[PDB]
Amino acid sequence: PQITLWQRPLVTIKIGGQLKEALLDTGADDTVLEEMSLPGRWKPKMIGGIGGFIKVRQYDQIPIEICGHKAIGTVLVGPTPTNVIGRNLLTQIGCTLNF
Amino acid sequence: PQITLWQRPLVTIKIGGQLKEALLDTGADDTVLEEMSLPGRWKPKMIGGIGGFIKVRQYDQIPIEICGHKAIGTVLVGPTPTNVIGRNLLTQIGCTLNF
Numbered sequence: 001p002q003i004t005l006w007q008r009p010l011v012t013i014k015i016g017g018q019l020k021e022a023l024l025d026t027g028a029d030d031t032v033l034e035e036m037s038l039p040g041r042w043k044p045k046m047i048g049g050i051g052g053f054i055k056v057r058q059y060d061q062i063p064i065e066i067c068g069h070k071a072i073g074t075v076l077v078g079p080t081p082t083n084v085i086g087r088n089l090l091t092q093i094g095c096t097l098n099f
Numbered sequence: 100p101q102i103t104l105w106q107r108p109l110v111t112i113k114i115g116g117q118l119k120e121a122l123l124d125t126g127a128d129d130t131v132l133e134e135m136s137l138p139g140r141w142k143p144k145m146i147g148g149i150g151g152f153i154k155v156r157q158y159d160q161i162p163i164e165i166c167g168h169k170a171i172g173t174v175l176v177g178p179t180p181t182n183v184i185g186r187n188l189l190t191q192i193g194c195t196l197n198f
């Protein structure tokens with residue numbers, strides 16, 4: 001589909017069998033979601049944003065559906081102000097910017 | 100043009116007679132640039148992202164050019180770790196997400 005930007009590009013995603021709302025964010029290298037439980041072991045990662053850095057848990061090869069599109073990749077979990085889908089997953093669903 | 104998301108979507112913008120590199124950021128409501136001088140009035144604003152909030156100066160009705168596309172809108176100036184082009188200007192150049 002084609003999504004205009006007059007409003008926030010918020011979409012429904014499915015992870016761990018649950019539906020959540022997330023923002024398609026081209027300004028993000030990675031995907032970071034609010035606190036939640038994910039399987040397996042995680043690795044640490046420090047990610048920097050507009051206001052500084054935060055600590056997050058990194059889970060790899062996690063199945064996640066975005067707007068119905070299937071993806072399997074790295075998901076960071078931590079104290080983010082909102083769920084954001086970064087380029088690591090936007091590329092998996094074939095997303096591009098056009099104008 | 101069609102911008103790939105395999106890499107960060109960086110573009111050249113022309114503002115205040117200067118040329119700067121900025122990130123096309125669909126997750127950003129506003130446009131924020133590192134410290135620079137801009138003409139006209141302004142008012143303080145606090146914007147929050149990953150890591151917390153930062154204080155910026157809000158300048159309205161600022162002419163800007165992105166990839167040859169002219170537009171006008173609000174530009175925030177402050178200690179942002181990187182230049183970001185937000186939805187308020189992405190809409191004016193007719194930028195959309197497609198997949």
Ligand SMILES: COC(=O)N[C@H](C(=O)NN(CC[C@@]1(Cc2ccccc2)C(=O)N([C@H]2c3ccccc3C[C@H]2O)C[C@H]1O)Cc1ccc(-c2ccncc2)cc1)C(C)(C)C
Pocket residue numbers: 023025027028029030031032047048049050081082084086124125126127128129130131146147148149175180181183185
């Ligand atoms: C390489 O780093 C990244 O890709 N970081 C991502 C990130 O923050 N991206 N933001 C952008 C992330 C988001 C997330 C958000 C969405 C809704 C509500 C609250 C927050 C954000 O915080 N945004 C803020 C923003 C930006 C411009 C103008 C106004 C505002 C207010 C707020 O919306 C836009 C979103 O895209 C742009 C950015 C890029 C590099 C560095 C850096 C930091 C340190 N050194 C150099 C550059 C700092 C910031 C993560 C989500 C993974 C943290």
